[PDB]
Design a protein around this ligand. Structure first.
Ligand code: PC1
Ligand code: PC1
Ligand code: PC1
Ligand code: 3PE
Lengths: 64, 57, 303, 63, 120, 173, 60, 459, 94, 99
């Protein structure tokens, strides 16, 4: 029970906002999110560049 | 077995069903509160029959 | 017409019977291993009767005995792709299973869970031969995990062994990596070709199935143990030698590659899509056979 | 553990067989509906339009 | 709003013209809830004084419900009356002031042009 | 044949005539002969049982029909009475339109398997007839979302309508 | 580390709940705890009159 | 619809006036009876909802939730039989009152016909659960548990209230039918995007959303056994049921600014699943897996594809059940050992074989193995996402990497493996645990055969 | 039995709490090497060398041979990281 | 002593008192009872009698109405050659296209 309390409870009472903690939180938090945003925003509009003047295949896509 | 104990052990049971059947009444009681378009819904303006009074109660 | 379908549909039915006796526990312990042995044996001998129809007539036919629901334009139904690929795979498969599980009861004879084992083999065929009879790709997927999560249980026949539990983890992991493409193929098929039936998928004549066959190729890599997702068979050998002989010799590993040959009307349509199949297949043969060139066991070389 | 198992199927089968024999009876004793054309004289009740005797039964009483 | 209403008589629970409105029914759900509120006061009173919370002081409970029902019934008469009064000068103002209240010749959807948003 | 070919067209039945020039007794035929006698006949009599007992009482059902309502086009703006009917009517047509592509799909499904490898040309009309069904189905319903509505269906229909109407004027040149 | 200790157990729990609850806690005593001498209280009333009358000038 | 409301309202006099011994015997014997009464609500029309009265109505979306709640209520009764046997009778009656009142507020909430009536009964449910979590909780932190619960939910609830009255003053009615028929496009003005932010963040908080999820690990873990199931099973899903209801007037701004949420769900679902595989507390696993599945349905509503709404309902009931057995199972190890550490108790089939059978089939149910409605609903989300974006599969396909990586993981370290020779506490399984196990999992295979009713309104 | 001391507190800066925390994890005074203290949250917990549960002596009379544990002896923070089923830190021939 | 407190009570194993216990209550006659309550309606009429109700809904969402109607409509337009359903439903005659 020293370990169980350690692995979950003791973190924040002993946590200190060091510069590296902010950086790791940045590259493991907001960072990876922006990775998904940029990749997902792109292909979404890339699709939207396809439909409007009819260059996308919809021969069977009737289950929107 | 004595009538009083069966009341003093099994009497709260008999109240749940009547509580439910009570609800059925207000559900029926609610029904006629909004008759409104009695047999003038467009799908269901079926011509009235003398045996009954309207399409549904 | 009168024969053929009803006979093989009975085969699916009749070896499911051992299972719901087992749940009802109508089996008297040691009777069940022989009891299931018998039922599988007739399941063989009856399966030849549809087979004999194929040698002479050669006809095939699809049954839709039930309709699950209708997703607007998609009406999921219990559709069976019953054909030469389906019918002839039946007798060879379970006769091999019938052959091995006899060697199992002689081998597997001391552990008091004989029945628990034997039923575990029994439902194993149920998930197998529904894949080869399935018509809608959803039904194939049902059996796809059905063998996968059950290999986990079967190779984990002994919970004392932690390597067995370890072995099941990558076995499911590599199998799960394969079925991502199955989902990817499902996703492509449900959006582009908006269908699940194998017959519907091919007959739409999707001559550009790049993303699907990428998914099916990935699906084989897990189920058929291609390169990358090979070492789960070197892990699955820990499960008893009978069941390892039953599952991980040629009976459910071929399901992954059999999936591609099922998709043959659209599998080979793209010449490029064929190319990395030869690429994925070749590296396995060099790598896997290299591994068996030195193996201090009698299981790895076979695998 | 085994006690819970056998009686739980016992209670399932206790009320399961009556509905099992009942569902067999209805489709082999009192028939199933077939399509017709109203002779414009009989007001068709809501539960009448339906296929199975139980379906018309439930609709007649609980619908 | 309406303390400045013409003819308004302060310190008068129910004015005369209120009686022309339908009196609330005895079985009015809001009224019977007020009675149920009177019941709930009965349990608490027995609870604070640590008496039998269900069978002690039935006379107290009987007063605790009837008083709530009475003040309930009169309150709903006023409740209906003000809403009726608000609806009265409502329709008095709409009729006496036509110009400020336009009745646009609203036209069916076959003639309007609502943009369709392609969702995906 | 409770169905009919006008909605469910199926290929005609053409069977070969075997000429067993061989001498071995054909096991396949004997398997059928024992099968109809041993399996069909008992269950057939049970099937013949369910016939006349179903015949001693035959309660009839009739079709549920709805009178066609004024559409949202003539439904007054922001009106709530006759909006109800037209919204109901459109959604039934939505459910209707799913079942006809389903019927063409089922017709499509049967066309391939029952015609073997010849379906490549035997379903050529069957393939083509689906495309006009699907493409027109998209024009009826596409990008409407989960909260589709008769107003939004007309908005899409209108949106396509002036685009082609302007294109037709442009095509006049 | 990146899952629990860095982000979940600390970071997301630092930004919204802990910091905002701290803010309530931090400036409570600046506004709740007061000296109690009568002079400053009405001294505080003083400037309130001008700012109301002059600074924003609720009269204008 | 007072067929179901009133008998539950009356259930409070029932339990309160029941005798000393029965109470729980009374509580179950009638809560099952109400369950089949609520089973009536399976009668849906095609698309026109069941409009029972001016204020109460139900549809193909609400009804599966109603049956889930009403039939749930007996389960925490029997589940709480063991945990709360020692306590005196009066609080016993009070505890059942909290459970009944909670289910009472749930059934009216799901069935309100006016948006504010939904809202008043939406957040009315934290009041009893706050009592349940804080008073009847077990571990010390339960004190801070309740604070995290209500404050998180309220922090988004009040913005909804201000938004709701604004729509009232703007359109003239918040009623579902009127707002649906008179639905108007929500423009792209900065005022309107904050209006969208107001009408969405309330449900997003108790969705939860990645980052806005701390309450469940700090509440479900330390919640009482009965309280813990109810939170995850249904009290998760008010926001969802509301979400498909309020999303009828937020168009088109949803398709434009749902990207940050679609982001935070997709990365979060992998993130929550990955951290789920790396907790030392088993109870945190069902909590962290819950949001992982729950993060999936937020994706469904955002794309608002018909197929997405298909699986949103199915996964809701599927997960709502799924968390229930695991919490029931995770409970069964706890009081036997008085700890929620998976490491302490391993390989329980060598001692409790039947418990293991229930454990694995609930686990494979979490795996979304077809034909179970867990997969088919979850699968429909994949198809809708692919329609939204073909790339979407990989991030969510990574979710079909971590789930079974943990969802069989506690099996091979709680029910599967060898046993420590020091715990003589482990005893035979009281039939209650297996019995409630039966009513817990047997349904999910049953309506699996017939998925159309719990599929949702998009049928 | 377990009131306050056993759970990790702050990082044992001073040698006095270094020894107290060494006693806290019932280890020796000299072999106690607490985790690095930089925004890390571990504090009292000591650095544990990468020795997986598969790597430990399989011939030892472990109280919990599941992952080769014993009674009372200290436990790695990433114990579940390196257990016999999961990743292993064991010598290889090459 | 500091805080005068009772020793922590030990878990009451129901099976040791009556080795036919059910995890329901101390008294065996109520204990065997509570089973007969849950092993009544719970499994009996909620699942089994419940299943036949839910599985025998009278035309849930009238999908059969669309079915036979779909059979009914397609033959009409296929009889006279019309390509069944049409690209548009609100036919051009009654709508008012802008300008
Ligand atoms: C209207 C509201 C806004 C206007 C009114 C308020 C104006 C002042 C705002 C700042 C107040 C003072 C902040 C004090 C502070 O940060 O103390 C150090 C605080 C408190 O430190 P601490 O005391 O917790 O540090 C010790 C930690 N343990 C207990 C584990 C040992 O630092 C932190 O919380 C970490 C760094 C900042 C993290 C938050 C920044 C990002 C916020 C994201 C969410 C935004 C919404
Ligand atoms: C096949 C038979 C399956 C039987 C399954 C029984 C258990 C599941 C249903 C339990 C009852 C559901 C609610 C119900 O019917 O309430 C009484 C119901 C409540 O509905 P009601 O009282 O408003 O009546 C509606 C039906 N009409 C209008 C025709 C009377 O009673 C009746 O339907 C009468
Ligand atoms: C709980 C749910 C209900 C919440 C609402 C409050 C309910 C409790 C209080 C109800 C009684 C108090 C108000 C009515 C009353 O007693 O006297 C009203 C009035 C009070 O007299 P009044 O209204 O002339 O003078 C009071 C001035 N105002 C209106 C600003 C408060 O009594 C009368 O006799 C009405 C005279 C004309 C009213 C104009
Ligand atoms: C419709 C009206 C329902 C209510 C009124 C009728 C109730 C009885 C219904 C039939 C019951 C059949 C089985 C009877 C078993 C009797 C066992 C027995 O005698 O237990 C007695 C005992 C209580 O003590 P005592 O009464 O003094 O007797 C022992 C003295 N040493 O020990 C006990 O614990 C007694 C507990 C017995 C409980 C019997 C069942 C009660 C609930 C029945 C209704 C449930 C369904 C409700 C809804 C019905 C409609 C849908």
């Amino acid at each position: 029970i020293r370990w169980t309390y350690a692995r979950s409870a003791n973190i924040y009472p002993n946590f200190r906002p060091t510069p590296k903690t902010s950086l790791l939180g940045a590259l493991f938090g907001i960072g990876p999110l922006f990775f998904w945003y940029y990749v997902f925003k792109t292909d979404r509009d890339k699709k939207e560049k396809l439909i409007q003047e009819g260059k996308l295949d919809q021969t069977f896509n009737i289950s929107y | 077995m004595n009538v009083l104990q069966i009341v003093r052990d099994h009497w709260v049971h008999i109240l749940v069903p009547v509580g439910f059947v009570f609800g059925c009444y207000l559900d029926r009681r609610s029904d006629e509160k909004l008759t409104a378009f009695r047999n003038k819904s467009l799908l269901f303006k079926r011509e009235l029959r003398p045996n009954e009074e309207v399409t549904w109660k | 017409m009168n024969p053929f379908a009803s006979l093989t549909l009975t085969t699916l039915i009749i070896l499911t019977i051992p299972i719901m006796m087992s749940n009802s526990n109508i089996y008297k312990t040691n009777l069940y291993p022989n009891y299931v042995k018998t039922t599988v044996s007739y399941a063989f001998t009856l399966s030849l009767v549809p087979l004999l129809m194929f040698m002479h007539t050669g006809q095939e036919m699809i049954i839709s005995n039930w309709h699950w629901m209708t997703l607007q334009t998609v009406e999921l139904s219990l559709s069976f792709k019953m054909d030469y690929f389906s019918v002839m795979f039946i007798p060879v498969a379970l006769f091999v299973t019938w052959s091995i599980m006899e060697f199992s009861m002689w081998y597997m004879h001391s552990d008091p869970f004989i029945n628990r084992f034997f039923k575990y083999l029994v439902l194993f065929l149920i998930t197998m031969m529904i894949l080869v009879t399935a018509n809608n790709l959803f039904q194939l997927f049902i059996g796809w995990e059905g063998v996968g999560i059950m290999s986990f249980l079967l190779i984990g026949w002994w919970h004392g062994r932690t390597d067995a539990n370890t072995a099941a983890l990558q076995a499911i992991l590599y199998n799960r990596i394969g079925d991502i493409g199955f989902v990817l193929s499902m996703a492509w098929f449900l959006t582009h070709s908006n269908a699940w039936d194998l017959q519907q998928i091919f007959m739409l004549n999707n001559e550009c199935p790049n993303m699907p066959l990428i998914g099916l190729l990935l699906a084989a890599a897990g189920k058929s143990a291609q390169f990358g997702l090979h070492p789960w068979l070197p892990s699955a050998m820990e499960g008893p030698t009978p069941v390892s002989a039953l599952l991980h010799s040629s009976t459910m590993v071929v399901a992954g590659v059999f999936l591609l040959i099922r998709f043959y009307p659209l599998m080979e349509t793209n010449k490029l899509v064929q190319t990395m199949t030869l690429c994925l297949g070749a590296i396995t043969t060099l790598f896997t056979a290299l591994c068996a060139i030195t193996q201090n066991d009698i299981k790895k070389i076979v695998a | 553990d085994r006690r819970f198992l056998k009686l739980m199927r016992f209670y399932i089968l206790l009320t399961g067989i009556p509905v099992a024999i009942g569902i067999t009876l209805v489709n082999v004793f009192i028939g199933e509906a077939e399509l017709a054309d109203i002779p414009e004289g009989y007001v068709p009740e809501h539960w009448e339009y339906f296929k199975h005797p139980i379906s018309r039964w439930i609709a007649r009483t609980f619908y | 709003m309406m303390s400045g209403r013409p003819g308004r008589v302060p310190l008068q629970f129910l004015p005369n013209e209120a009686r022309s409105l339908p009196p609330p029914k005895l079985t009015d759900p809001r009224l019977v809830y007020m009675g149920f509120l009177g019941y709930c006061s009965g349990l608490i009173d027995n609870a604070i004084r640590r008496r039998p919370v269900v069978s002690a002081g039935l006379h107290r409970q009987l007063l605790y419900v009837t008083s709530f029902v009475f003040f309930g019934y009169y309150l709903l008469k006023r409740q209906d009356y003000m809403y009726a009064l608000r609806d009265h000068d409502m329709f008095a103002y709409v009729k006496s002031h036509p110009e400020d209240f336009p009745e646009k010749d609203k036209k069916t959807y076959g003639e309007i042009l609502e943009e369709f948003h392609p969702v995906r | 044949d409770s169905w009919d070919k006008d909605v469910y067209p199926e290929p005609p039945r053409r069977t070969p005539a075997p000429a067993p020039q061989t001498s071995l007794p054909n096991p396949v035929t004997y398997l059928t002969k024992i099968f109809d006698l041993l399996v069909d006949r008992p269950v057939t009599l049970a099937r013949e049982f369910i016939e006349q007992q179903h015949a001693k009482n035959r309660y009839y059902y009739y079709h549920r029909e709805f009178r066609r309502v004024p559409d949202i086009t003539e439904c007054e703006e922001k009106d709530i009475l006759c909006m109800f009917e037209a919204e109901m009517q459109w959604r039934r047509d939505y459910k209707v339109d799913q079942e006809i592509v389903n019927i063409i799909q089922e017709r499509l499904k049967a066309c391939q398997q029952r015609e073997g490898e010849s379906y490549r040309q035997n379903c050529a009309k069957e393939l083509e007839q689906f495309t006009q069904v699907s493409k027109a189905f998209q024009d009826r319903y596409s990008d409407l979302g989960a909260h589709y509505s008769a107003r939004k269906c007309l908005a899409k229909q209108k949106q396509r309508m002036l685009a082609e109407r302007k294109a037709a004027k442009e095509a006049a040149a | 580390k990146s899952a629990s200790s860095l982000l979940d157990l600390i970071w997301l729990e630092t930004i919204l709940p802990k910091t905002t609850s701290f803010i309530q806690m931090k400036m409570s005593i600046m506004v709740s705890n007061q000296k109690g001498l009568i002079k400053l209280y009405f001294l505080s009333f003083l400037i309130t009159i001008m700012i109301s009358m002059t600074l924003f000038n609720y009269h204008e | 619809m007072l067929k179901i409301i009133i008998p539950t309202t009356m259930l409070l006099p029932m339990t309160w006036m029941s005798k000393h011994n029965m109470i729980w015997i009374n509580a179950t014997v009638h809560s099952l009876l109400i369950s089949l009464i609520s089973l009536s609500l399976l009668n849906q029309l095609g698309e026109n909802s069941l409009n029972f009265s001016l204020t109460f109505f139900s549809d193909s979306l609400s009804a599966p939730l109603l049956v889930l709640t009403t039939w749930l209520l007996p389960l925490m009764l029997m589940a709480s039989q063991s945990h709360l046997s020692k306590e005196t009778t009066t609080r016993k009656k009070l505890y059942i009152t909290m459970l009944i009142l909670l289910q009472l507020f749930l059934i009216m909430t799901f069935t309100a016909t006016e948006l504010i009536l939904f809202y008043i009964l939406f957040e009315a449910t934290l009041v009893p659960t706050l009592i349940i979590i804080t008073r009847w909780g077990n571990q010390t932190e339960r004190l801070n548990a309740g604070l995290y619960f209500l404050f998180y939910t309220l922090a988004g609830s009040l913005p909804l209230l201000v938004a709701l009255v604004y729509i009232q003053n703007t359109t003239g009615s918040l009623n579902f039918l009127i707002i649906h028929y008179w639905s108007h496009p929500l423009s792209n003005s900065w005022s309107n995007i904050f209006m969208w932010l107001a009408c969405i963040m309330a449900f997003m908080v108790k969705m939860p959303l990645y980052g806005l999820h701390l309450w469940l690990p700090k509440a479900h873990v330390e919640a009482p056994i009965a309280g813990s199931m109810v939170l995850a099973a249904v009290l998760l899903k008010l926001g969802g049921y509301g979400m498909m209801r309020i999303t009828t007037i937020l168009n088109p701004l949803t398709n434009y600014m749902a990207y940050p949420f679609l982001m935070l769900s997709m990365w979060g679902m992998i993130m929550t699943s990955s951290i789920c595989l790396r907790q030392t507390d088993l109870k945190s696993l069902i909590a962290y897996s819950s949001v992982s599945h729950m993060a999936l349905v937020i994706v469904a509503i955002m794309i608002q594809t018909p197929w997405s709404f298909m699986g949103a309902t199915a996964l809701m009931i599927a997960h709502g059940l799924t968390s229930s057995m695991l919490f029931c199972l995770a409970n069964t190890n706890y009081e036997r050992v008085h700890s929620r550490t998976m490491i302490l108790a391993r390989g329980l089939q060598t001692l409790l074989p039947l418990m293991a059978t229930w454990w694995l089939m609930a686990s494979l149910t979490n795996l979304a193995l077809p034909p179970s409605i867990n997969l088919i609903g979850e699968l429909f989300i994949i198809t809708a996402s692919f329609s939204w974006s073909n790339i979407t599969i990989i991030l969510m396909g990574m979710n079909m990497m971590i789930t079974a990586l943990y969802s069989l993981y506690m099996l091979i370290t709680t029910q599967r493996g060898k046993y420590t020779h020091h715990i003589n506490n482990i005893k035979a399984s009281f039939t209650r645990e297996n019995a409630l196990m039966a009513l817990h999992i047997l349904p999910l295979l049953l309506l699996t055969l017939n998925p159309k009713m719990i599929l949702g309104p998009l049928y | 039995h377990v009131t306050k001391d056993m759970f990790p507190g702050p990082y044992p800066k001073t040698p006095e709490e270094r020894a107290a925390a060494a006693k806290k994890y019932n280890m020796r005074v000299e072999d106690y090497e607490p985790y690095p203290d930089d925004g890390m949250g571990y504090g009292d917990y000591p650095k544990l060398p990468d020795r997986s549960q598969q790597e430990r002596d399989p011939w030892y009379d472990w109280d919990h041979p599941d992952l080769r544990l014993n009674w009372g002896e200290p436990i790695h923070w990433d114990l579940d990281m390196y257990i016999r089923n999961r990743v292993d830190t064991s010598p290889t021939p090459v | 002593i500091r805080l005068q407190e009772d020793p922590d009570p030990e878990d009451e194993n129901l099976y040791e008192k009556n080795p036919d216990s059910h995890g329901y209550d101390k008294d065996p006659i109520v204990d065997l009872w509570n089973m007969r309550v849950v092993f009544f309606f719970g499994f009996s009429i909620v699942l089994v009698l419940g299943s036949t109700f839910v599985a025998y809904l009278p035309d849930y969402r009238m999908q059969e109405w669309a079915r036979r109607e779909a059979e009914r409509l397609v033959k009409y337009r296929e009889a006279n050659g019309l390509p069944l359903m049409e690209s548009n439903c609100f036919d051009p005659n009654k709508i008012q296209l802008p300008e």
